[PDB]
Amino acid sequence: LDFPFTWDGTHLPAQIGELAPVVKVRTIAGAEAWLVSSYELVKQVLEDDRFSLKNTSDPGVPRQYALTIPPEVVNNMGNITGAGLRKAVMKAINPKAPGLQEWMEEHAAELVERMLKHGAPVDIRSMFTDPFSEAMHCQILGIPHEAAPLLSESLPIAFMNSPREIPAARLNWDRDIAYMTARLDDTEQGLIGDLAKLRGTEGYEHVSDEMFATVGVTLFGAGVISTAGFLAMALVTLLTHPEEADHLADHPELMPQAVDELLRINLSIGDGLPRLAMEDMTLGEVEVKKGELVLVLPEGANFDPSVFPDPHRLDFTRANSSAHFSFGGGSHYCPATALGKKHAEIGLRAVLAAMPRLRLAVPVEQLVWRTGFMKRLPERLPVMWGSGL
Ligand code: HEM
């Protein structure tokens, strides 16, 4: 059995309902892995640090797909440490930072006004989900918003899931590190301004300029692809459930709970969350050997009908929506869940408040699904909307 199963994000792959909780798969890099897909066993793996994320990038171990970050930088990740580093990052991704909610509300409103000026149809990825995600990451890093197009150009290659090394990935990595290194010298605000303040002070002698830049580049990359991927596929969910989208547009007070259910039902994760077994361990009816690759499948857990009865139904009032695994779990639980949810709430409210009776402008089977990539994503998402308010 080959993994992944399909790049089509219109509905849960048929294969998910056919998997045993743990099954042997062949990865894109050609290695063997244990695919874990029940809620109980996804929870088990994610909450047990003997399943190691850090060790999945060790030289020689079985791989899901090729590294896209240069191996010498990957190998130096464990040395990027400091009370002030963790502090700087936690502060930058806090959605309560003064001005940030106001900035996101204005920028979302402006992007939606440009779609309305253009008229239907528009590609809501290129006119909204992408620029709204890219600009917010420029805002929290403290760099100019004109960086968004330069840095974003790397991302369709940087998050590829390739069987082989990707030459473009190194060229783009070096170009992005150079840009972020330059910003350490001229940036006074946000994550980069904070990192510049630590550089050449006590406790930070062990952090190179390259290592400071690495924090900027990887946080920009991770944040932008997670938020732009989620928001595109949250719109795909809403555009395949038009009567629910119409209901949410009329009941904006629902938006906090709606985002939890959109996260639970979301199909943007195109791979598995990798972990390396650091000991012999039992996982349900399977015996995992030390050094074996485990692939956690969030969509398996999230559509497990023993936890989420009627899992294919989009139900904004679903009581346990917030128990999903779309932000992972355990030690590596997304640190930016507060910001990802607030960003989605603001973006989706701006779209639904201004574009009445929002509809797919093409038959759902005429969407073009990105292949060979960490996220399921439609290449374009053409939409139309009715008149008036
Ligand atoms: C809806 C938006 C987002 C989604 C769905 C999402 C999802 C995830 C998931 C599933 C993980 C776990 C990966 C694993 O266990 O292997 C993760 C980790 C992480 N996310 Fe998020 N994320 C979102 C937004 C963001 C944002 C905005 C940032 C940063 C600005 C970010 C930064 C990170 C980082 C740095 C990690 C790694 C944490 C670690 O290794 O301990 N995420 N995210």
Domain spans of the chain? 16-384
Residue closest by Cα to atom 19 of ligand 1: 334
Expressed in angstroms and rounded, the spacing between residue 222 Cα and the centre of ligand 1 is 7
> Which residue has its alpha carbon closest to ligand 1 atom 35?
219
Distance CA 40, CA 322 (A): 16
- Buried b / exposed e along 47-63 (16+ C-beta atoms within 10 A): ebeebbbeebbeeeebb
**Inter-axis angle of helices 337-354 and 100-118, nearest 10:** 30
Contacts of residue 61, defined as CB under 8 A and 6 or more positions apart, other chains included, come to: 55, 276, 291, 293
- 138 has binding-site annotation: no
Ligand 1 neighbourhood includes 232 CB (under 6 angstroms): no
- Distance from C-alpha of 322 to C-alpha of 316, rounded to nearest angstrom: 11
CA distances for 170 relative to 162, 180, 210, 243, angstroms: 14, 15, 14, 45
The answer to whether 275 is a known ligand-binding residue is: yes
Q: What is the DSSP letter of 364?
A: G
Q: What residues are paired with 373 via a beta bridge?
A: 160
Q: From CA 225, how far away is CA 220, in angstroms rounded?
A: 8
User: According to the annotation, is 332 in a ligand binding site?
Assistant: yes
Q: Do the Cβ atoms of 66 and 97 come closer than 8 Å? A: no
With a CB cutoff of 8 Å and minimum separation 6, the contacts of 273 are: 46, 53, 295, 296, 298, 328, 332
By the 10 Å C-beta count (0-12 exposed, 13-18 middle, 19+ buried), 378 is classed as buried
Q: What is the DSSP letter of 235?
A: H
For residues 321 and 264, the answer to whether their CB atoms sit within 8 Å is yes
Q: Confirm if 230 and 194 have CB atoms less than 8 A apart.
A: no
Nearest-angstrom CA–CA distance, 263 and 161: 22
Q: Which CATH class is domain 16-384?
A: mainly alpha
Ligand 1 atom closest to Cα of residue 53: 16
DSSP 91: H
Please tell me the distance between residue 307's alpha carbon and the centre of ligand 1 in angstroms. Answer: 23
Residues 6+ apart with CB under 8 A from 24: 1, 32, 33, 34, 35
**Does residue 330 come out as left (phi exceeding 0), alpha (psi in the -120 to 50 range) or beta?**
left
- Whether residue 151 contacts residue 179, with contact meaning beta carbons closer than 8 Å, is answered with yes
Alpha carbon nearest to ligand 1 atom 10, residue: 327
Please tell me whether 48 is known to bind a ligand.
Answer: no
Resolution in A: 1.9
